[PDB]
């Protein structure tokens, strides 16, 4: 099903201002997000499903067309609950918020992504050994979050706590041995 049905949302993602009439597929998929929400399969996750996660994040951030805010919340719930059925391989989906959500100052849809971004270290603390991509994306994203949120953000307590976390998916043995690239000293970093 994730191969056959899951192909349909990828095609359906291509709707920003050109369709404006074919909202029937949007409601058809929105009213049938319970099927994916109601299960926690693929703990093994042998097949690469990072594409599905990327598409889900796209439709989460695809608020430019009609969004149907109730369906928007349904998609948010589906994406948030899908973060439990994977064994932390969605490297592209992990770096996407750094490129999009971290860059955005909670403009339109950055807060829903930041909610899951802050929820991830709760299960990733003292476990979830990092990789090369994870260890490389951790400090840049952490620095962006810890520089962007301090001053130019608002005074909203929920918005402040929406990104306020230690956010350290540190491993037990090691994650990466590539040359550190400040632009291409651990005491001065933090």
């Amino acid at each position: 099903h994730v191969l056959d049905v899951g192909f349909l949302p990828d095609m359906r993602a291509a709707a920003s201002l050109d369709t404006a009439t074919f909202s029937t597929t949007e409601m058809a998929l929105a009213l049938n997000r319970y099927l994916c929400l109601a299960v926690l399969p693929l703990i093994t996750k042998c097949a690469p499903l990072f594409a599905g996660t990327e598409h889900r994040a796209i439709m989460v951030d695809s608020m430019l067309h009609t969004v149907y805010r109730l369906s928007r919340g349904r998609s948010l719930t589906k994406a948030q609950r899908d973060v439990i059925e994977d064994c932390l391989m969605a490297l592209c989906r992990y770096i996407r918020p750094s490129m999009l959500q971290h860059l955005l100052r909670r403009l339109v849809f950055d807060v829903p992504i930041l909610n899951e971004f802050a929820k991830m270290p709760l299960k990733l603390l003292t476990n979830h050994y990092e990789r090369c991509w994870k260890y490389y994306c951790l400090p840049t994203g952490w620095a962006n979050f810890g520089v962007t949120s301090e001053e130019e953000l608002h005074l909203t307590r929920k918005l402040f706590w929406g990104i306020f976390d230690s956010l350290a998916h540190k491993k037990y043995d090691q994650e990466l041995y590539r040359m550190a690239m400040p632009c291409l000293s651990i005491e001065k970093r933090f």
């Binding site: 603390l125 301090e150 306020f164 976390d165 230690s166 350290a168 005491e187 933090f190």
Partner: protein
């Protein structure tokens, strides 16, 4: 930037010890410097939580040249004298309004990495000014008298010696035998400081209004100190608190000072039988005093029958206030002695005759009206491991151990004989029927095979069956406790 800065300090705190044991000096000192700029800041929202957390784990040799905190060594002592000296005069502000900033500064008990040349100033900086307010001072009830035991560290000063600060000023000012000549100069105050409270034997807590606020710090501290040379100070230190606690024998001594000091020093190192033989009878007398609580529940129960009187505020209002706080500290007495008592019980039956003869009424009378303890234990169980339930924790390993017939199988046979919900009056019936077994059972090589070698003089009497007749009966009431609580 306050909450996130404090939160990341919880995890990356102990990084000094396992990794970079000596190379972590620059990191720890660097963080502490920025934590001082918040001392002036006053905010409507409470920010004290990050203050204690930051300094709690910040400490976690001479190679610290970039450490400007070398110049910050005198900075910490600067705020020490500010509050204490001003508070001597000190009502709306006779509370934690001005002392809320002193808890984070003082608490540095174990993690010591820097010296800061603050060796003997502290005993004179705040402790001696704090001695000014030790007595009544013609002031109302003290707001935070326990800060002396808390903020006053137990000999975490790296050096103690009298007559140095008041006489040796220019000698150290001008500037390799050090801390060795005053090998006997240390014992000048304890020989006098301990003499005052011990002679004090008043009943009510009012005549000692502020006495409990100063008793813990000295005895607990110096008992550890100087253990290498003089073991006598540790020996008499056990007697020091033993005598003072005799005033706790009264059913109503303290309702707020009793728990604070009981948990202040639940420590005994030389109070066991070998160091302090009299502590057994000293605590045995406390057992008799503790038994008086049992009569309260039984006496008030008769009047509570059929709700003839106002039992709402009369029957229940008696035992909860007194019984519950007392028994916090008696548990450690048998726990420490439990390492030797069964071995001493194996050596002879007289090891814990008094202990076996006592602590029975703790559960004997508390079969019913258990709510009297729960209400007084609101601080504990509100949030299973009730202190009342763990009262026979040391007793169940000793009290039924030496009952009678050390290795004769009569113990199990007697328990089976009385396993009939036997009433107290009916307990005499089992003494006339008898139940013994010289079986070829597991008494063969291992069970009941320690006892005869361990009982060189196995005293067994027909009357001693009565002594064993009570051990199993107590277990009958304790049998339902596990199943009933659910």
């Amino acid at each position: 930037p306050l909450i996130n800065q404090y939160f990341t300090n919880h995890c990356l705190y102990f990084l000094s010890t396992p990794a970079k044991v000596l190379g972590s000096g620059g990191h720890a000192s660097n963080k502490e410097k920025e934590m001082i700029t918040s001392l002036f800041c006053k905010l409507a929202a409470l920010v004290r939580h990050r203050v204690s957390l930051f300094g709690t784990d910040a400490p976690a040799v001479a190679l610290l040249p970039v450490l400007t905190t070398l110049f910050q060594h005198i900075a910490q002592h600067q705020f020490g004298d500010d509050v204490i000296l001003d508070d001597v005069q000190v009502c709306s502000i006779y509370s934690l309004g001005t002392t809320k900033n002193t808890y984070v500064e003082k608490l540095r008990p174990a993690l010591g990495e820097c010296l800061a040349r603050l060796a003997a100033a502290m005993p004179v900086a705040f402790l001696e000014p704090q001695l000014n307010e030790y007595n009544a001072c013609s002031v109302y009830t003290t707001k935070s008298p326990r800060e002396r035991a808390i903020l006053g560290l137990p000999n975490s000063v790296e050096e103690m010696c009298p007559d140095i600060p008041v006489l040796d000023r220019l000698m150290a000012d001008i500037g390799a035998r050090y801390t060795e000549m005053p090998h006997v100069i240390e014992i000048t105050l304890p020989m006098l400081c301990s003499y005052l409270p011990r002679w004090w034997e008043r009943g009510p807590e009012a005549p000692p209004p502020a006495l409990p606020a100063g008793a813990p710090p000295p005895c607990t501290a110096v008992t550890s100190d100087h253990l290498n040379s003089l073991l006598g100070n540790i020996l008499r230190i056990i007697v020091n608190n033993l005598g003072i606690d005799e005033a706790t024998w009264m059913k109503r001594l303290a309702v707020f000072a009793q728990p604070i000091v009981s948990r202040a020093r639940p420590e005994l190192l030389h109070s066991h039988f070998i160091p302090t033989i009299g502590r057994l009878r000293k605590r045995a007398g406390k057992v008799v005093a503790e038994e008086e609580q049992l009569r309260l529940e039984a006496k008030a129960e008769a009047e509570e029958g059929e709700l003839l009187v106002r039992d709402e505020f009369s029957v229940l209002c008696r035992d909860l206030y007194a019984l519950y706080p007392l028994l916090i500290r008696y548990v450690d007495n048998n726990r420490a002695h439990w390492l030797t008592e069964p071995n001493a019980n194996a050596e002879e039956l007289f090891r814990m005759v008094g202990e076996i003869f006592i602590y029975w009424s703790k559960s004997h009378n508390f079969k019913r009206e258990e709510q009297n303890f729960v209400v007084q234990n609101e601080i504990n169980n509100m949030s299973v491991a009730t202190l009342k339930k763990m009262l026979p924790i040391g007793l169940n390993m000793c009290a039924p151990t030496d009952q009678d017939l050390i290795m004769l199988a009569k113990t199990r046979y007697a328990l089976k004989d009385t396993d009939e919900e036997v009433r107290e009056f009916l307990q005499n019936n089992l003494h006339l029927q008898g139940k013994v077994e010289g079986s070829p059972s597991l008494r063969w090589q291992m069970a009941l095979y320690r006892g005869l070698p361990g009982r060189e003089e196995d005293a067994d009497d027909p009357e001693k069956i009565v002594r064993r007749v009570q051990e199993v009966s107590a277990v009958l009431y304790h049998l339902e406790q596990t199943e009933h609580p659910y």
